[PDB]
Structures are given as structure tokens and as C-alpha cells.
Design brief:
Elements: E1 7-10, H1 16-27, E2 31-36, H2 45-48, H3 53-56, E3 57-61, H4 67-74, E4 79-82, H5 92-108, E5 113-117, H6 143-148, H7 152-171, E6 175-180, E7 182-184, H8 194-204, E8 214-219, H9 220-232, E9 238-242, E10 245-248, H10 249-259, H11 285-289, H12 297-310
Parallel strand pairs: 1-2, 1-4, 2-3, 4-5, 5-6, 6-9, 7-8
Antiparallel strand pairs: 8-10
Length: about 325
Amino acid sequence: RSVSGQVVCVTGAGGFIASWLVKILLEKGYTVRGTVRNPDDPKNGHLRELEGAKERLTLCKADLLDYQSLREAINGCDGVFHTASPVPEQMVEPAVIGTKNVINAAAEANVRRVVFTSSIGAVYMDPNRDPETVVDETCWSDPDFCKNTKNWYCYGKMVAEQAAWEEAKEKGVDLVVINPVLVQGPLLQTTVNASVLHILKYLTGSAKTYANSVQAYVDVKDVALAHILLYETPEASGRYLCAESVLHRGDVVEILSKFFPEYPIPTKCSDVTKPRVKPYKFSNQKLKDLGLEFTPVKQCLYETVKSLQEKGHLPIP
């Protein structure tokens, strides 16, 4: 009831993280202006059906490359959640233009705070960092290294966040950054987004083996709540790593097989020669200290599968 009449913009509202963010904002009583490239497109239908959306969700047609469209969405907002930073090497250029546009429009509209959705891609890849060093918010990825190794995801995410800070400092905008890892969780959309596809291949039996590698995971609802916490907490500042666990692919398939023995999940690693890659260490203490409670990765994977079943992407025996 406290936030009634508060107006916030969420860019790229139809995305995985963004859809959950809109959902929860609406539940907490916010008025939400969500940007999508085509409001009348059926793929945004899920947004219009969210609790509170009829009364309090305005879907604004905007494109990150179209400054006036963004100004029209952002004008009259108290806050902006810039979640759309699309990163082929193709992704690198536009995430930067959009970020600059959004920050500049926020500045002109005298927005109180912008929360920018960055990524682990802006944090992890640094060849000059000791592999035993705990990964935290002081860690930035090395763009020269990512460019040279053709890791365009890392390159684009790093330069987009770098651009965000530079533009916010230049225009005097209060910017806070969240850095999610690989996000999993239940689907609001009818279609499966790219991150959840990572799990689907195991459950359909398309993946006959699992790879020798590790990744950090986090629940999508935690990520959404964290965005809100960063917006609402006056003392929030800087970047915030949003991750719950680092798992080997093997740990992931083990978790899935124990919960869902009925599916053709792979049991063998593709690499039988080199030793198992070890999970790296990280700290999510900065977000915990703000009061965020993290959903265990096991629960998150469980809920992801149950949602895939519910949405007709997996059979229910």
C-alpha cells in the first residue's frame, strides 16, 4: 500500500527476468510501464493477463534504438529497470546504444534511480585473476581478452555495463547494477526462453552426454525480487552479484535424474580424459546483507521442470 501511485518502467518486459519482475512489481502495488517492440504481438499476451495488469500495466511500444520511444515510456516514472541489453558478435553494439538511450531518458525525466540488469559476463572472464580468488562484485571481466577469444557474450556484457556507469556518472543518475548468472525457474511465457533450454535438452534425451564444465545458477524469482530490493533500498550502491550455487553439468543432471527418474537424462560425461572442472568460489554476501534470501538451486531446477510439464514441453507420466 506504501508504493501505490509509484510508477516504474521495465524495459523489454516480455523477457524471462523482466516478465517475473513485472509480475512481482504489480503484486506489490506498483504502476508499471513495460516496453516491448510490438504490444499487439501475441507473445506479450502473458503480460496482459498478470494480476493487476489490466489496472496498472501499460505496455509501451519502444525500441532500444529509438530514443523518443524510450522517452515516452520513461517520462513520468519514478524508477527504471533497464533489463533489456541484447547481446553472434551482433549483440555487442546495440546493448550499448540502448543503455545510453535509457540512462539519458531517465536523466531527462528526473527519475530517482535506474536499476540496470548486467550479467556474470561482465564479471568472470579475466585471465589475470587468480582462479582461486573468490569471485565477487570487485571482479570485472577483461574485454580485450574476451574480444581476442571471440567470447562476444562476455565482451558485450562488459562494455554495456561499462557504458551504463559512464553514462550515469556523466548525467548524474543514481544507477545500481545487478549481475545475475544463469537464471532458471518457472515460465510465464508459452515458449521456452534461452536459459531454460539449457535444462530442456537433458530432459528430452537430446543430450546423450553432459559436458565437463561448471556454471553458476540462480532462481528467476530471486533475481526479480533482488531488482526490487535494489530499487527500494536507499543505501543500495554499486553492483550486486546474484548467484546461488556453482554446479558442474554432472551435478545438474544428477539433481534432475533423482527428481525425475522417468526422463532420458544423460548419465555420462562427454569428456572422459581430462579431470572434472571444479566449481569456482564466489560471494553473494552483498545481496544477502540487504536481506535477500536465495532459493536453493535444487528447488529452482525442480520448479523449472514442473513448469515445463505444465506448459506442455515435457510429458507427464
